[PDB]
Amino acid sequence: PFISLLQGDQFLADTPIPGSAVIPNSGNLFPKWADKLSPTAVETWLFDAMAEDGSAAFTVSFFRDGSQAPASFRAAINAAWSDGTVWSQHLVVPVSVVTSDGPDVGHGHVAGVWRTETRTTASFDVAADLSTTTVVFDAPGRITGSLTHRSLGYPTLPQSDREAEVAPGAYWFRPIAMANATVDLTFHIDDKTEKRMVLGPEQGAFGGMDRSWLPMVWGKEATDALFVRAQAGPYVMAVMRLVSKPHKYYQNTVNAALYRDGKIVSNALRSLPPDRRDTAATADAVRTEKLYDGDGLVAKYRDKNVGYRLEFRSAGPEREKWSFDLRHHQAWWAKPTSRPGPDGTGNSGFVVEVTGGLVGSEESVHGWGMTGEVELSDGHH
């Protein structure tokens, strides 16, 4: 059984060593820095869930971040309730181990455990099938309980290095694009008060599993990082969009997908200038545009946006375009990503209300989703 075990005080490499290669048609769930972690790399395993009506939302990211050494191993957790409660905490642990069962390192049952050797355990499990996941928390006085996914089998796996990229040589994609989700969690509201979050298997709760690794930290490559997961009528959409630093001229990159009743209708690996709204389509693409007009909570940091517009394009024969407005409905989290002031930037999570549909039609669907809206400084020239 393949094992990547990082612990103690010597897990970090001395130089930024390379990570192992993209495996085509695989979840790529085994760590790319298996034995020694590069000091500028970060690996991410993301699992999330939300109510189909936006009444609850949950996300956890399991991190191995070399640049945060010694505190490199983190389970970052955010939760939101319809009544206004929000809950955000990092579980920082000294041990992160990931195993993969089977002869094929790109196609085996995977288990991750972020843990102590107070007491903290946070773990995930993914079927070799990618058919199911289980996430379990055991952190007394903070969070306990589980999340599970049952995959709906949407097409999603990258067939090449290019399809796995979210930017050149940086990777973010979705080994499970869409899943029936359950949660059964208990949170300690430290304001000993407990709060429950329960989403059962027949309530239409949904979520996905996202996988990322970057040889270089985002703080030095991006000025903008947008995450989206949303569902509206037949449509399911998921986005990770990057806008680079000025030294690369605000390169616009994305790894995104739009589905209609489970069929992928835009394999969007091209991110368009936000002020275009034309009909050109030499490839599937998505346009992400900050919205400032109309309904929605106003974000607090660099950009005072009330939401985002997502316009998907298909290069298929019918040349369809879909447009959705994702408007800030509930402020989930909000954290500075720089010192305050005129150049100040932030990291904001929202539950969003979703409207829109097929352009040129009478379609007007309605739904719910989440966004993670990250801003980073423009840097020194």
Residues whose CB is less than 8 angstroms from the CB of residue 343 and which lie 6 or more positions away in sequence, other chains included: 377, 378
* CA-closest candidate to residue 81, choices 185, 181, 180: 185
Residue 111 CA to residue 98 CA, distance in Å, equals: 6
Residue 87 CA to residue 73 CA, distance in Å, equals: 20
Is the omega angle on the peptide bond into residue 16 within 30 degrees of 0, that is, cis? no
- Total count of residues recorded for the chain: 381
Which residues are paired to 370 by β-bridges?
229, 351
Query: Domain 221-381 belongs to what topology?
Result: AttH-like fold (2.40.370)
**Experimental method reported for this structure:** X-ray
Amino acid identity of residue 121, one-letter, is: T
* CA-closest candidate to residue 144, choices 113, 116, 123: 123
Helices (H), the chain: 161-164
Residue 88 CA to residue 210 CA, distance in Å, equals: 19
Residue 181 CA to residue 179 CA, distance in Å, equals: 6
The greatest distance separating any two alpha carbons of the chain, rounded to the nearest whole angstrom, comes to 60
Which residues are paired to 91 by β-bridges?
75
Amino acid identity of residue 254, one-letter, is: V
Residues whose CB is less than 8 angstroms from the CB of residue 176 and which lie 6 or more positions away in sequence, other chains included: 27, 126, 130, 133, 149, 151, 156, 208, 209
- Across 157-199, the runs of DSSP E, i.e. the strands, are 165-167, 170-189, 193-199
Residue 31 CA to residue 279 CA, distance in Å, equals: 40
Number of other CB atoms surrounding residue 378 within 10 Å? 14
- Unique residue bearing structure tokens 């990931």: 98
- 356 membership: H or E segment, kind and range: strand 346-358
CA dist 369 to 236, 246, 297, 319, 356, Å? Answer: 9, 30, 14, 26, 13
Residue 192 CA to residue 140 CA, distance in Å, equals: 12
Cβ-contact 125, 47 below 8 angstroms: no
The secondary structure of residue 105, as a DSSP letter, is T
* CA-closest candidate to residue 20, choices 10, 32, 12: 32
Which residues are paired to 67 by β-bridges?
none
* CA-closest candidate to residue 332, choices 368, 359, 289, 357: 368
Buried b / exposed e across 255-266, counting CB within 10 Å, b at 16+? bbbbbbeeebbb
Q: What are phi and psi of 218, to 5 degrees?
A: -70, -25
Residues of the chain with CATH 2.40.370: 1-216, 221-381
Residues whose CB is less than 8 angstroms from the CB of residue 131 and which lie 6 or more positions away in sequence, other chains included: 150, 151, 153
355: exposed, middle or buried (Cβ count in 10 Å: 0-12, 13-18, 19+): middle
- Across 102-192, the runs of DSSP E, i.e. the strands, are 109-115, 121-126, 132-139, 143-151, 165-167, 170-189
Residue 101 CA to residue 266 CA, distance in Å, equals: 33
The secondary structure of residue 349, as a DSSP letter, is E
Cβ-contact 8, 70 below 8 angstroms: no
* CA-closest candidate to residue 51, choices 188, 203, 229: 203
CA dist 318 to 79, 267, 281, 314, 362, Å? Answer: 40, 15, 11, 8, 17
Residue 99 CA to residue 309 CA, distance in Å, equals: 39
- Yes or no: is domain 1-216 CATH 2.40.370? yes
Q: What are phi and psi of 157, to 5 degrees?
A: -75, 140
